[PDB]
Amino acid sequence: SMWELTILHTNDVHSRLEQTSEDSSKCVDASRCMGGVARLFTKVQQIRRAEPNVLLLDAGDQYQGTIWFTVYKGAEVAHFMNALRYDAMALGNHEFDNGVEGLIEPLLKEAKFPILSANIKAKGPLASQISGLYLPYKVLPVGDEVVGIVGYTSKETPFLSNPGTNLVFEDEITALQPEVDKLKTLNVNKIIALGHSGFEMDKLIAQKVRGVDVVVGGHSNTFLYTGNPPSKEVPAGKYPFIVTSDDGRKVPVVQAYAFGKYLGYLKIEFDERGNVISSHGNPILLNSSIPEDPSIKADINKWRIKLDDYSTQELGKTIVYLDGSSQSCRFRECNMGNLICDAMINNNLRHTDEMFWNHVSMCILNGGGIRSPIDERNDGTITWENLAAVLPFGGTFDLVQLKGSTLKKAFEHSVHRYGQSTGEFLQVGGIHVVYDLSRKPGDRVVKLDVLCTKCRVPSYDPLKMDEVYKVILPNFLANGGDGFQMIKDELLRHDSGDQDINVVSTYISKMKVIYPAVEGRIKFS
Ligand SMILES: O=P(O)(O)COC[C@H]1O[C@@H](n2ncc3c(NCc4ccccc4Cl)nc(Cl)nc32)[C@H](O)[C@@H]1O
Ligand SMILES: *[C@@H]1O[C@H](CO)[C@@H](O)[C@H](O)[C@H]1NC(C)=O
Ligand SMILES: [Ca+2]
Ligand SMILES: [Zn+2]
Ligand SMILES: [Zn+2]
């Protein structure tokens, strides 16, 4: 006999509860808007009504991304994931943004579906407090069968969030294998690994973890597609991505990009012993052709009311596209990057009573901290909401005194694994950097000119290794985030500065009309 399972899946929704523009920014032209829970619901229901055996799965990073999360703090996530009748979720690295308390009380206690992570181990007083609220696996009934779903979360989570020192993030493969074996001994022949580690780790899992039939991932924002893709996202491989396992089997790996723009859709065809005979599908583009469900939309609008406080007051206006996309800001100079740094610099110079930092002209900004673009087409209005999506962490723009040799080392770190859309890539201000990627990591920086401080007229002179420089940057980087160990360890002074979003709102309010360009601050050769 045969048994067909349809896996529906989302990942990295990032609090895009409402429908959004093509590029994930705030929705304005509703006729061309995409995604959102209301639209998703409609599509999920069409599938549920057509297919008898269906599972709806999330692979983490529902938390953090828009004012939805700033205001409702995870309660919106639980509430609307419950309304969509999610079958399971894997804990993501952003689910630990508001601490463990901020995971437990809004989400884990209010979610009506199992929330999973096998490689997160609770220790000390936390263990008994959190016992049962998340699980390593869940065995779900699906018709006359059962499907084991085993959870995992990125080992990078303690460096990217706030899980605390009571949670230990074990290696995924080590953590998973006993759980998958345990399931086998419980006569569970169909096993899905749902987790939040990235496409590369998902592939390793499929290869290395005996017993796993399917891997449904997230974290890396990977778009997979079989055929001609329906939008601007460039596929990284076929959907499903077939990994050939060490134990001689074809294991489908899947992911569904990000921002609720696509619903992932995989039909698995199983035998009576839970082996994958075949699988096919593609991620479904959630566009205007799919109507928003009326009930969910009405419910969204009810919850929306509280949020409209953050959209009312126009801070200012842009007359250019503010390119805060991952694809620009992690790979090259992006004008949103330049806007944010110029604001960091400018706002700091307002504090004239402070003697030490009032000629600071140099800025570095982790591109991965830039989380949304802003559109210029509705008279390019900029509200607080628009700004919250760009900078959703709520950190500070701190001030550091760094040696020249430290900065060279940071800019070397900035491109040490270039090509993988990682967040360490540095947007800059008062700095003209030139990379040669043909060279090896640790020696990719061929030119690094910075603005002189001890000079009457500021010009760009070469960074000297033994000179000392004053730089403005996010506290995340100052605290040694994004693997910038050299900053934390080699900084000479570190002063806590102003709140990130306030700095950029204050700047925009001051300027009225903004038009940041790409000027050749970061060049390649
Ligand atoms: O998003 P994901 O697809 O799950 C993985 O993205 C990874 C990238 O995001 C950036 N990042 N990560 C974290 C991060 C932070 N504070 C994290 C943080 C620290 C303490 C408390 C709460 C939080 Cl929330 N602050 C900035 Cl200003 N930037 C950041 C990096 O650039 C990295 O490479
Ligand atoms: C929605 O996506 C489908 C499938 O890619 C496409 O054929 C259709 O034109 C799209 N409709 C829009 C953008 O209105
Ligand atoms: Ca099996
Ligand atoms: Zn994410
Ligand atoms: Zn993530």
Closest atom, ligand 1, to C-alpha of 368: 31
Q: SS3 helix, strand, coil % of the chain, rounded to 5?
A: 30, 25, 45
281: left (phi over 0), alpha (psi -120 to 50) or beta: left
Q: Which residue has the tokens 């944010």?
A: 340
Angle separating helix axes 75-83 and 294-307, nearest 10 degrees: 170
Helix, strand, or coil (residue 10): strand
> Cα(93)–Cα(479) distance, rounded to whole angstroms?
18
Closest to 254 (Cα-Cα) out of 290, 287, 279: 279
> Cα(447)–Cα(309) distance, rounded to whole angstroms?
46
CA of 13 relative to ligand 3 center, distance in Å: 29
> Cα(426)–Cα(447) distance, rounded to whole angstroms?
15
Residues with CB under 6 A from ligand 2: 230, 285, 287-289
> Cα(331)–Cα(367) distance, rounded to whole angstroms?
8
Closest to 151 (Cα-Cα) out of 193, 198, 93, 88: 193
Range list of β-strands (E), 51-142: 54-58, 88-90, 115-116, 120-122, 137-142
Q: Which residue has the tokens 């590369």?
A: 200
Helix, strand, or coil (residue 34): strand
What is the DSSP code string of 465-519?
Answer: TTSEEEEEEEHHHHTT-TT-HHHHHH-SEEEEEEEHHHHHHHHHHHHSEE-----
Residue 193, H or E segment: strand 191-196
Closest atom, ligand 1, to C-alpha of 12: 3
CA of 455 relative to ligand 2 center, distance in Å: 58
- Cis check for the bond before 283: say yes or no (omega within 30 of 0): no
Looking at ligand 2, which residue's alpha carbon is closest to its atom 8? 289
**Within 10 Å of residue 447's Cβ, how many Cβ atoms?**
13
> Cα(58)–Cα(196) distance, rounded to whole angstroms?
9
Q: 517 Cβ partners below 8 Å, 6+ apart?
A: 320, 335, 338
Residues with CB under 6 A from ligand 1: 61, 93-94, 97, 160-162, 219, 366, 368-369, 393, 395, 422-424, 474, 476, 481-482
Tokens describing residue 197 = 């580690």
Closest atom, ligand 1, to C-alpha of 474: 27
Report whether 280 belongs to an annotated binding site: no
List, in sequence order, every residue forming a beta bridge with 115; answer none if it has no partner: 89
> Cα(447)–Cα(203) distance, rounded to whole angstroms?
37
CA of 366 relative to ligand 4 center, distance in Å: 16
**Within 10 Å of residue 128's Cβ, how many Cβ atoms?**
9
- HSE (CB half, 13 Å, CA atoms) of 426? 34
Mutation test residue for ligand 1: of 476, 477, 479, the one with most atoms within 8 Å of CB? 476
**In a 10 Å sphere around its CB, with 0-12 CB exposed, 13-18 middle and 19+ buried, how is residue 364 labelled?**
buried
Q: Which residue has the tokens 């950190």?
A: 395
Dihedral sign (CA 512, 477, 473, 418): negative
**Cα-flanking dihedrals φ and ψ of residue 181, to 5°?**
-60, -45
Distances (CA, A) of 264 to 268, 355, 498: 13, 55, 40
Report whether 359 belongs to an annotated binding site: no
**Within 10 Å of residue 211's Cβ, how many Cβ atoms?**
23
What is the DSSP code string of 446-459?
Answer: EEEEEE-SSSSS--
Residue 126, H or E segment: helix 126-129
- How many residues belong to the chain? 525
Closest to 257 (Cα-Cα) out of 53, 61, 457, 453: 61
Domains 2-305 and 306-524 agree in fold: no
Helix, strand, or coil (residue 379): coil
Technique behind the model: X-ray
Residue type, 43: K
The answer to whether the beta carbons of residues 93 and 161 sit under 8 Å apart is yes
Q: What is the largest CA-CA distance in the chain?
A: 83
Residue type, 411: F
Residue 41, H or E segment: helix 37-50
Closest to 149 (Cα-Cα) out of 121, 113, 199, 122: 113
The answer to whether the beta carbons of residues 14 and 61 sit under 8 Å apart is yes
**DSSP 8-class letter at 131:** B
List, in sequence order, every residue forming a beta bridge with 474; answer none if it has no partner: 397
Q: Which residue has the tokens 């949670």?
A: 167
Helix, strand, or coil (residue 88): strand
> Cα(118)–Cα(5) distance, rounded to whole angstroms?
23
Distances (CA, A) of 43 to 34, 262, 381, 428: 13, 10, 32, 42
What is the DSSP code string of 144-181?
Answer: TEEEEEEEEE-TTHHHHS---TTEEE--HHHHHHHHHH
Closest atom, ligand 2, to C-alpha of 287: 1
> Cα(122)–Cα(403) distance, rounded to whole angstroms?
40
CA of 12 relative to ligand 5 center, distance in Å: 7
Q: Are strands 396-403 and 513-514 parallel, antiparallel or unpaired?
A: unpaired
Mutation test residue for ligand 2: of 34, 232, 289, the one with most atoms within 8 Å of CB? 289
Gyration radius from the chain CA atoms: 24
For domain 306-524, give the CATH number: 3.90.780.10
Closest to 339 (Cα-Cα) out of 311, 358, 320, 352: 320
Looking at ligand 2, which residue's alpha carbon is closest to its atom 11? 289
The answer to whether the beta carbons of residues 369 and 474 sit under 8 Å apart is yes
List, in sequence order, every residue forming a beta bridge with 256; answer none if it has no partner: none
> Cα(149)–Cα(114) distance, rounded to whole angstroms?
10
Say how far residue 49 (Cα) sits from the centre of its chain.
32
> From edge to edge, which strands make up the β-sheet containing 522-524?
460-462, 445-451, 431-435, 522-524
Angle separating helix axes 199-208 and 172-185, nearest 10 degrees: 40
Closest to 57 (Cα-Cα) out of 242, 237, 227, 265: 265
Tokens describing residue 364 = 């570095």
Residue 389, H or E segment: helix 384-390
520: left (phi over 0), alpha (psi -120 to 50) or beta: left
Q: Which residue has the tokens 């953050």?
A: 310
Domain boundaries, the chain: 2-305, 306-524
Closest to 58 (Cα-Cα) out of 229, 258, 212: 258
**Cα-flanking dihedrals φ and ψ of residue 345, to 5°?**
-60, -50
Helix, strand, or coil (residue 78): helix
Closest atom, ligand 2, to C-alpha of 288: 14
Tokens describing residue 36 = 């959102």
Please name the CATH architecture into which domain 2-305 falls. Answer: 4-Layer Sandwich (3.60)
